[PDB]
């Protein structure tokens, strides 16, 4: 299976007084492993997964240096973009950045990402070849030219194909008990009468990891989308995920309906036949 390492950065200007609120989180796949918050007392990158605590003092010293430098970059950027978009010094604005790398099932570099947004909208992104940029508007063309002149892409590509991958591999090995474990969904169905003549069938998928899953209802062996509700996949809080899908059916007819569950943790899709 492929694995990813991603870092997500959000900076929010507070023109009233002081520097931007800055929050950085790091993930391996769907597991957070580090965080920095400018408002926290430590002013350090902090662990958020047991397996990253294996890393000694020098790891933390290094990531703190870099994450603080990142915060200054996004502060400057908030100033610059305000200028490009001719905005008031009064209002709060946001810059978001996400970057990282995937390895394939062969544990080799697969893909690299670097995307940047201002005020919740695409601004600039590195293309898949890791050699050029996509600018969303004319302001972004300024940044594109500057980064092209300064060979940012080359620097990023070296990181993504190298350093990024190497550490991802290290993390996967150190945190193998959890990072490389697939938790298949624990499934069940509930039944709720909504009248004398109709009932709700709810098919639940619980405690699964990673978050990717497909839940669907079939009626007599054909997918059924009418009269169904599907909630978005949601975190349980213990590192796993939950989802459910529900259908309303005539009472007595529950047997026609089947819930189908697909997940990387299941060799074969599950078919629930009941209620």
């Amino acid at each position: 299976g492929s694995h990813s390492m991603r870092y997500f950065f959000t900076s929010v200007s507070r023109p009233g007084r002081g520097e931007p609120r800055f929050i950085a989180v790091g993930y391996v796949d769907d597991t957070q492993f580090v965080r920095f918050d400018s408002d926290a007392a430590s002013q350090r990158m902090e662990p958020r997964a047991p397996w990253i605590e294996q890393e000694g003092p020098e790891y933390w010293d290094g990531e703190t240096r870099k994450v603080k430098a990142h915060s200054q970059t996004h502060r400057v950027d908030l100033g610059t973009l305000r200028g490009y978009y001719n905005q008031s010094e009064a209002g709060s604005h946001t810059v978001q950045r996400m970057y990282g790398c995937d390895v394939g099932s062969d544990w080799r570099f697969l893909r690299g990402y670097h995307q940047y947004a201002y005020d919740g909208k695409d601004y600039i992104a590195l293309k898949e070849d890791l050699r050029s940029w996509t600018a969303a508007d004319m302001a972004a063309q300024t940044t594109k030219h500057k980064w092209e002149a300064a060979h940012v892409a080359e620097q990023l590509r070296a990181y993504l194909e190298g350093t990024c991958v190497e550490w991802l591999r290290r993390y996967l090995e150190n945190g193998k008990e959890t990072l490389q474990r697939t938790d298949a969904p624990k499934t069940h169905m509930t039944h709720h009468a909504v009248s004398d003549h109709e009932a709700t069938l709810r098919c639940w998928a619980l405690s699964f990891y990673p978050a990717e899953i497909t839940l669907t209802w079939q009626r007599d062996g054909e997918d059924q989308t009418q009269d169904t509700e599907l909630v978005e996949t949601r975190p349980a809080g213990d590192g796993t995920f939950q989802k459910w899908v529900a259908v309303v059916v005539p009472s007595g007819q529950e047997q026609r309906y089947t819930c189908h569950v697909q997940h990387e943790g299941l060799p074969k899709p599950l078919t629930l036949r009941w209620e």
Partner: peptide
């Protein structure tokens, strides 16, 4: 691990 040095926009 984080990238070492980001350029300003």
């Amino acid at each position: 691990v984080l990238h070492d040095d980001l350029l300003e926009a």
